[PDB]
Design a protein around this ligand. Sequence first.
Ligand code: HEM
Ligand code: HEM
Ligand code: HEM
Ligand code: HEM
Lengths: 142, 142, 146, 146
Amino acid sequence: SLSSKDKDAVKALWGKIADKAEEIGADALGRMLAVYPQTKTYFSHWKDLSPGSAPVNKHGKTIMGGLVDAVASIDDLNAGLLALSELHAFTLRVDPANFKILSHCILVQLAVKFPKDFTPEVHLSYDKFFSAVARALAEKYR
Amino acid sequence: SLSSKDKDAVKALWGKIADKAEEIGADALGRMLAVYPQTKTYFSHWKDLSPGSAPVNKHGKTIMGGLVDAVASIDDLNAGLLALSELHAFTLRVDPANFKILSHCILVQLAVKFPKDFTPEVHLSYDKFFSAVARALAEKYR
Amino acid sequence: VVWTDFERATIADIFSKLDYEAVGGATLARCLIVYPWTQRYFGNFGNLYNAAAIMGNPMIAKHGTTILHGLDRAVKNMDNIKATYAELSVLHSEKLHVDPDNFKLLSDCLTIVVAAQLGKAFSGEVQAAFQKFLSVVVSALGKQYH
Amino acid sequence: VVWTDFERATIADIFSKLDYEAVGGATLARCLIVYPWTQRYFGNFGNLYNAAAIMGNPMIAKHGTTILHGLDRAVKNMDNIKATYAELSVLHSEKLHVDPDNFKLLSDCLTIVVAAQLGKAFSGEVQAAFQKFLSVVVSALGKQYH
Ligand code: HEM
Ligand code: HEM
Ligand code: HEM
Ligand code: HEM
């Protein structure tokens, strides 16, 4: 479970990244596709997977919006992300083993832009946060 | 989350196995130790690790009582297993990678004695139970 | 891998007891029902999300048979599994992009199907030899870095 | 593995920019704090039930520096990583019994420490080459079945 300390750290990060959020999502997605090419199968309808392509920019915005919802719903991610869970299970059927990949690429992306926020205790909170989001998205698989 | 369907299925199994429960605990632990020898380091006290050795017998009863506890507490596993979660994090420091191995060994042991109970839909309910048990024992790590 | 005599005997002994069609069909159905996201990898296999649908599916039955014959190739080449699986490893990564966790899930399903069939005969010692075999198999099926 | 010119030059260039002591100590400390169960493998490195204690623990710093020099060994032998890591794999499997998932936790912590140091120069394409190198390393460090 997330502690009140973890939730505070997550909320404080989300505040700081506002001007750069849409670029963070697009870059993180660009990272997933190139670094873990097994994920490309889910997006084989984008001809340009570079982080400045129109489809990747525009889907990076959507991801960051789904994460802004997770932040809003941080007290009960399981109830809060239920529709997104059913989507990724039943419309898209995404191997839920890919969630940890995307979380990692978001952390990496955040690190390159905001390195001073990556203290070890801050990193621990952020990782606990992305783990809980992934477990929430995994809820409706079975 | 376990459905009411899953919960019934788990409780009915635990009922059917009652007679043989001490044996099942002893044998599954025997299986974990012989099949996945990385697990031996946690038990480098026991003179004998064979099925039939009194410390294996005794600790097998102990695991199975922890599981009949989890069964009693099936509606909120996190709350009901808090103390055992703490023990496995701080007194022992068990790698939660190991939780999944014990679960499989118990499923295997039960399959050898009660093959008819193992339809795919029933196996699904049992696996969701053991996954929930492991997540609960993992709660106090960080 | 260095195999003991007991291990070689056990492994050939287990497979000589299994009906590949029955057991392969059951294993694959089990995996798609217990871990239903594995269904994504067989999206061109038909009626697939009711549980009686998966059990009745003739394509699934056939593909489960194919898996058991693939394992047989490793049983008949136990000292040369990596080379034997070179094309299958390429297939399951480069072409099909199967996440390697799934090889463990399927392996566990097969073990459970086997334990139910063999009963008391599937002792911890026997299971130990079977799991060593599956670990070599899975390591050979995963993406090769060397 | 087969390395492209770009992959080969990127790996050498990343490592040419790292303070092995700074990066290695930060990396091991990060792993022990973010994934606290990894502490149990290190039961001979003083006190570890506290972030401040982990952060100023001289043995943790020393062993972090050792890991980076162990990785530098792979950088100097890019086409012979498996044999290069033969004895380390035995150590980490047969003597230490390190669950292989732990290799991924540590690798992920290195990646994030490296990303924070290198900034916008750690692009997706650089990270791709870096991750291929850590996958090769992790594969050669794990139990060898073949
Ligand atoms: C941080 C975790 C994730 C979040 C918060 C997230 C969020 C979302 C949201 C909000 C949408 C809706 C798109 C729309 O409204 O148009 C979406 C769609 C989608 N997601 Fe995710 N997602 C995550 C992880 C993943 C992963 C790991 C994959 C695959 C490797 C994936 C594959 C997809 C696909 C294929 C769609 C539909 C794409 C399209 O409409 O073009 N997602 N996601
Ligand atoms: C389903 C998962 C598990 C359950 C339900 C469980 C339950 C228990 C219980 C009830 C105890 C007794 C504590 C007491 O005496 O108050 C115990 C102790 C212990 N557990 Fe577990 N355990 C589980 C998994 C594991 C695993 C996977 C390992 C390591 C491979 C492990 C290692 C230990 C050890 C070393 C002890 C102390 C035994 C002794 O001191 O003799 N446990 N566990
Ligand atoms: C012990 C594990 C496995 C073995 C021995 C195995 C073996 C095989 C074999 C022999 C084939 C036929 C390739 C050919 O035509 O020559 C195959 C195909 C295939 N496998 Fe696997 N496989 C295993 C695990 C998996 C897993 C876990 C998945 C999915 C999550 C998977 C997905 C597929 C798919 C999608 C095909 C193509 C289906 C077809 O048209 O035949 N396999 N596998
Ligand atoms: C990229 C990954 C890693 C590399 C390159 C690496 C490299 C090394 C090296 C060079 C040594 C010294 C060996 C010797 O003294 O001959 C060592 C020792 C050791 N490693 Fe690793 N290692 C890695 C990951 C891990 C992980 C993940 C763990 C556990 C979580 C671990 C636990 C240990 C322990 C417990 C020792 C012995 C410590 C001592 O007694 O001084 N290592 N490693």
